[PDB]
Amino acid sequence: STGSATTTPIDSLDDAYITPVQIGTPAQTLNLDFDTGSSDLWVFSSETTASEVDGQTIYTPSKSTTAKLLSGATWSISYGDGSSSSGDVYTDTVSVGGLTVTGQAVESAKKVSSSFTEDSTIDGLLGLAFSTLNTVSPTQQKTFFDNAKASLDSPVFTADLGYHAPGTYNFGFIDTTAYTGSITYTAVSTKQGFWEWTSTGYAVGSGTFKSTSIDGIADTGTTLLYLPATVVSAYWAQVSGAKSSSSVGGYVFPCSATLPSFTFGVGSARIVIPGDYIDFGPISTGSSSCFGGIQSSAGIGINIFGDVALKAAFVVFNGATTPTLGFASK
């Protein structure tokens, strides 16, 4: 089998992407944030505290003839941005882009933190990291990809995120029309449960490429590119007037600037992020200070190849027995 679904930016800055997902019988379609940095499929639901729902579409398990309470199971997750959610668990039929999994754990939120409530466009998350990170207790649950893998034509999914435009998540096949040149594959460590790999270096604009190993994760659920402070300083030093602002929480730059590109290495290959992808706009409405899309990872503990980086490539998440990542230009 295969599946193919369109993913759409939630706003004009590509702050996140939503993909429609059919849950239950008859189908209830919710727009979920596909997140290769976590491993829980959770939804706003009829069980969510009413004051914490503000415009989201909810899953109502009592209206699904295929929903079954997973008795005793609970979940609770906290994300790298400080947001969180928790609740109980049903199994139900879940379909993405024509690909159907029966018996998928659907984690029903009883509580969500303010950032989720405040984003009316995201009805939940669909985790695509390794199932070892799933938070369901006492019986850990598998991701949608893990459950679908055996049925897929090839044990892969691909992320093709758009810049200010829709893109595609495919399951089970590699669309050879969706990229240019060849796909370069690189080794993955699953020891932290992430799609963790080592980039071979970077360049700033037309500058020379610096060969240096940068361990990080391919994370579709993170907006920006988080890299070591040395790398980030070298980038922003090429932008007149750019500075790191403690009050804002990262590098800002004059909105009048033209940003240089940023290149990262995948083996001997190179992915170029155009400068425009690094502009996240005024820090507040009407400000002439703009927020940068490359930020320091120093306060995180891991480097994160988020959407800013991933949207510049066609990315293969290869879930073969030995997983690997593939990157192509497009």
Q: Separation of termini?
A: 25 Å
Class of secondary structure makeup: mainly beta
CATH fold-type name of the largest domain: Cathepsin D, subunit A, domain 1
Please state roughly what percent of the residues sit in beta strands, choosing from under 5%, 5-15%, 15-25%, 25-35%, 35-45% or over 45%.
Answer: 35-45%
Major sheet summary line: 7 strands, mixed
Keywords: Aspartyl protease, Disulfide bond, Hydrolase, Protease, Signal, Zymogen
Family: Belongs to the peptidase A1 family.
Active site: 35, 199
Domain Peptidase A1: 17-328
Tell me what you see in this structure.
By secondary structure, the protein is mainly beta. The protein folds into two domains: 5-174, Cathepsin D, subunit A, domain 1; 175-330, Acid Proteases (Cathepsin D, subunit A, domain 1, Beta Barrel), CATH 2.40.70. The chain contains four helices and 24 strands. The chain has helices spanning 114-118, 144-148, 229-236, 307-310; strands spanning 3-9, 17-23, 28-35, 41-43, 68-78, 84-96, 99-112, 124-127, 156-160, 167-171, 184-187, 196-204, 210-218, 225-227, 243-245, 250-254, 262-266, 269-273, 279-282, 289-292, 294-296, 303-305, 314-318, 324-328. The strands form three sheets. A seven-stranded mixed sheet has the order 18-17-12-13-22-14-21. A six-stranded mixed barrel has the order 2-3-8-4-7-6. It is globular and about 60 Å long.
Task: Explain briefly what this protein structure is.
The chain has 330 residues and is mainly beta.
